[PDB]
């Protein structure tokens, strides 16, 4: 009795957004993929991987490593399993599968928490006696773990016959056929069924105790938050950062994956990713790396681990400033800066999203190949690829690779089959939860709100507070990189200022002529001068074609806003 079964796990983005360090962000996405894997194990055990329509499991690194027992490399570190799955099961097992999937996920999370509790006390995450471990495992804390994720499971019989026109009209969309006959419509209706069951389950959480909250998510009671005041609670935790049970799991999760796979993400914090800019860290380490680590340990042994700085922010002089051994480091750092340039302090957050069961299987296989192999190949070791679950991507990138990676991924998606994207350039000090929410706002409320979508939304949030946003078509990235304008700008602010400040005074009927003027005024032998002006004007006109805007004025504003972002000397040192 063939039955189409749908699995959905929530929440996703709220859980992922509850992050302070880059490791939290990776662990969040990775754990979510792990939860779907634990769920799909139940399906595969009975019906094999070929009964899972979406996603394609045969290519999934989690499936290859944890189910088939293959020796998978560092590609296990990427979250590739999405939060929705579709499978075909026997009808008599449907209800039992639902119960068992829910149970696997509860148990797995509870087990992770018990280990996290043990790990936390033994490694000084919580400065408490080992006798207080029982307090951490009390029911109030276990409730939070047990109830956090909602796993909705709905199904519909494929064998049942129904009047097609009646079932589709009533749903809000021989005349009597089996439901599998209208499979495409059935998949969508099953999504509706699932959404109904989501709200039947996710509003059943238990009220929590009075007390101070986790500093990472801010919403759940921190462990020991009901038994101490704020100042004392903070002193009990590493980095004065109290954690709820879910964020404790999040902090423990990297070492769990480490023990399970031997693997760990190469770039640990956003600073590690930031310092990839123009190979700055690599150049520095070759030239000054040995000396710095020596002086660093001279200040404190806790600053050095495995012949490296315990935190990559120690490449910034300001980190050392905020006694005589410290002054020796800052003078050394400042000397290096004058030689090889100031260290990059900005990084980029990239989020992307897309705008017969046998045919559906083929689609899933194409999405699997794109997400697992293609996106990974593009990103490679140029940054950190955290999530690629089909038509959606989350990566952390150095600012000099952000546009290129995003464009490449977009083109790769085109070869396989439109994607919109948000890129947020942000200071390494900015709170990660806010950066991620801004990045998704760029994607969801800017790029996807443009008619026809398929848009890149680039945001630059300066440390001082300003927030510049430019909406561009994907072809703008190609045109710009090959343009003489780019080489001239990076060979400036005055040209860009004049245009942005005065574009609203330009006549609607004569925008092009005013562009000609500003090029004449800012671009200059007379032989080369005439050629450069003609070329750059043509490039500007080409670029304007791919800027998102109501009118020519907004297109000009959008373009020179883009130019202002990429010429920002503070962001691109």
């Amino acid at each position: 009795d063939p039955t189409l079964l749908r699995i959905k796990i929530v929440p996703v983005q709220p859980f992922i957004a509850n992050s302070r360090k880059q490791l939290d962000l990776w662990a969040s996405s990775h754990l979510l993929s792990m939860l779907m894997y634990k769920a799909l194990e139940v399906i595969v055990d009975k019906f094999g991987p070929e009964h899972v329509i979406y996603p394609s499991l045969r290519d999934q690194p989690f499936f290859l490593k944890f189910y088939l027992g293959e020796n998978i490399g560092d590609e296990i570190l990427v979250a590739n399993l999405p939060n929705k799955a579709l499978a075909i099961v026997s009808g008599k097992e449907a209800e039992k599968i639902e119960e068992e999937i829910k149970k696997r996920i509860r148990d797995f999370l509870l087990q992770l928490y018990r280990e996290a509790v043990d790990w936390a006390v033994e490694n000084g995450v919580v400065k408490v006696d080992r006798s207080e471990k029982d307090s951490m495992l009390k029911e109030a804390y276990l409730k939070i773990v047990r109830e956090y994720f909602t796993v909705s499971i709905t199904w519909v019989s494929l064998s049942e016959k129904e009047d097609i026109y009646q079932v589709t009209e009533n749903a809000g969309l021989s005349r009597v056929l089996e439901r599998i006959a209208i499979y495409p419509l059935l998949v969508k209706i099953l999504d509706s069924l699932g959404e109904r069951k989501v709200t039947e389950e996710r509003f059943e959480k238990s009220e929590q105790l009075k007390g101070w909250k986790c500093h990472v998510c801010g919403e759940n009671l921190a462990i020991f938050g009901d038994m101490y005041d704020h100042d004392n609670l903070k002193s009990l935790w590493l980095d004065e950062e109290p954690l709820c049970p879910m964020c404790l799991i999040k902090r423990y999760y990297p070492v769990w994956i480490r023990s399970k796979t031997g693997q760990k993400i190469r770039f640990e914090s956003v600073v590690d990713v930031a310092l990839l800019y123009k190979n700055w860290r690599k150049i520095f380490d070759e030239k000054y790396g040995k000396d710095l680590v020596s002086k660093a340990r001279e200040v404190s042994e806790d600053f050095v681990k495995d012949n490296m700085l315990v935190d990559s922010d120690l490449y910034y002089s300001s980190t050392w400033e905020s006694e005589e051994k410290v002054k020796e480091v800052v003078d050394f750092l400042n000397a290096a800066y004058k030689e090889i340039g100031n260290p990059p302090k900005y990084y980029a957050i990239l989020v992307m999203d897309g705008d017969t069961p046998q045919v559906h299987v083929a689609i899933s296989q194409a999405l699997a190949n794109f997400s697992i192999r293609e996106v990974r190949s593009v990103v490679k070791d140029e940054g950190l690829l955290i999530y690629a679950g089909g038509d959606d991507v989350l990566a952390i990138l150095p600012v000099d690779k952000a546009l290129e990676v995003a464009y490449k991924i977009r083109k790769e998606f085109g070869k396989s089959f439109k994607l919109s994207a948000g890129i947020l350039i942000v200071h390494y000090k900015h709170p990660l939860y806010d950066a991620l929410e801004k990045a998704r706002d760029l994607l969801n409320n800017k790029a996807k709100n443009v008619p026809g979508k398929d848009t890149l939304a680039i945001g630059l949030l300066k440390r001082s507070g300003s927030y510049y946003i430019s909406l561009v078509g994907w072809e703008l990235i190609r045109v710009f990189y090959n343009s003489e304008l780019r080489k001239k700008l990076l060979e400036g602010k005055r040209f860009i200022y004049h245009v942005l400040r005065e574009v609203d005074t330009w006549p609607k009927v004569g925008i092009d002529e005013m562009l000609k003027f500003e090029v004449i005024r800012h671009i200059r032998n007379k032989e080369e001068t005439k050629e450069l002006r003609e070329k750059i004007y043509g490039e500007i006109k080409d670029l304007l074609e791919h800027v998102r805007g109501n009118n020519e004025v907004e297109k000009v504003r959008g373009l020179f806003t883009f130019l202002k972002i990429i010429t920002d000397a503070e962001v691109f040192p």
Partner: protein
């Protein structure tokens, strides 16, 4: 109760906003919804607190006697007075009356709240160059409506080409006013300017910061909302500043930036909402709202303050009427 603080700039003012979107390197604080220049309540409160604190420490605060804060601290905190006074000298806490009025320094924040709520300084009159009468005190219907609403609760129709202006701005017989390089035709009106002046007189008194308010009436220009907004955004001072490498005698690397200034002769107003003093065991002369209000008026009425940055290059000075 509440106190209305009138602020009249006598030098250009730079209340810095990092979050403001602008083509200028260092723009001034502005309201999100209107785009009007503003001084944040928190900026103003910091200014007021710093002045009040200095006066208290220097025994210059009057409550009609000399306020002796260490004496009052001992007759209030009793056994805990000495350690508190020690914290004040250690700059961990502020003197007694300062903390009563503005709240404890951050170290003692949770003990109690500040009695006052310092509101944004909202723009009221913005100076614009006039062909006649040197310059005009410019405002708009939306501004007047905001002022009236703020005052009424605490207790006009113009096209883009029209202005309701005082006589000293109007070209003889031409019925025109010229603000900077644009021409506005004078709309006949009888009481709107007069009504506005009356409101100003009811809040700040007969003398307008050192001049009769009747003199101001002749140089007030009411323009449309769009025109006023345009002037407040594009007529503020935009000044280039540099740093000179004295070794070479030329402008240093990265030594050029642009800064925005609110002009002198700008009138702004902030409503200071005063609640009951919240500290425990208050001295009698400051144990309620009216007494806090009275000290605020005497301390800041006719005072000179510096608001915003660039103090040492002569910016941010305002006259105060409370």
């Amino acid at each position: 109760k509440a106190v209305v603080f009138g602020l009249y700039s006598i030098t250009p003012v730079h209340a810095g906003s990092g979050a403001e979107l602008s083509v200028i390197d260092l723009p001034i604080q502005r309201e999100r919804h209107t785009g009007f220049p503003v001084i944040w309540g928190q900026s103003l409160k910091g200014v007021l607190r710093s002045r009040f604190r200095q006066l208290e420490l220097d025994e210059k605060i009057e409550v009609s006697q000399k306020w002796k804060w260490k004496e009052k601290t001992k007759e209030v905190l009793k056994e805990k007075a000495d350690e508190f006074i020690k914290k004040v000298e250690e700059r961990k806490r502020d003197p007694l009356l300062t903390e009563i009025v503005f709240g404890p320094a951050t170290d003692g924040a949770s003990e109690h709240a500040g009695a006052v709520s310092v509101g944004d300084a909202k723009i009221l009159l913005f100076p614009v160059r006039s062909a006649k009468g040197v310059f005009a005190f410019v405002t708009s219907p939306i501004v007047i409506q905001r002022l009236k609403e703020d005052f009424e609760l605490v207790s006009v129709e113009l096209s883009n080409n029209e202005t309701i202006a005082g006589n000293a701005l109007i070209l003889n017989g031409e019925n025109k006013v010229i603000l900077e390089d644009i021409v506005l035709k004078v709309k006949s009106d009888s009481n709107v300017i007069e009504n506005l002046v009356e409101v100003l007189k009811t809040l700040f008194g007969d003398n307008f910061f050192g001049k009769p308010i009747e003199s101001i009436k002749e140089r007030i220009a009411i323009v449309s909302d769009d025109v006023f907004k345009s002037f407040t955004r594009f007529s503020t001072e935009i000044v280039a500043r540099v740093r000179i490498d004295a070794e070479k005698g030329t402008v240093a690397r990265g030594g050029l930036w642009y800064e925005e200034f609110l002009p002198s002769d700008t009138l702004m107003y902030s409503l200071i909402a005063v609640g009951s003093p919240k500290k425990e065991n208050l001295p009698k002369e400051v144990d309620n709202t009216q007494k806090i209000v009275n000290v605020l008026k005497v301390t800041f009425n006719n005072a000179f303050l510096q608001i915003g940055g660039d103090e040492t290059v002569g910016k941010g000075f305002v006259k105060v009427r409370a």
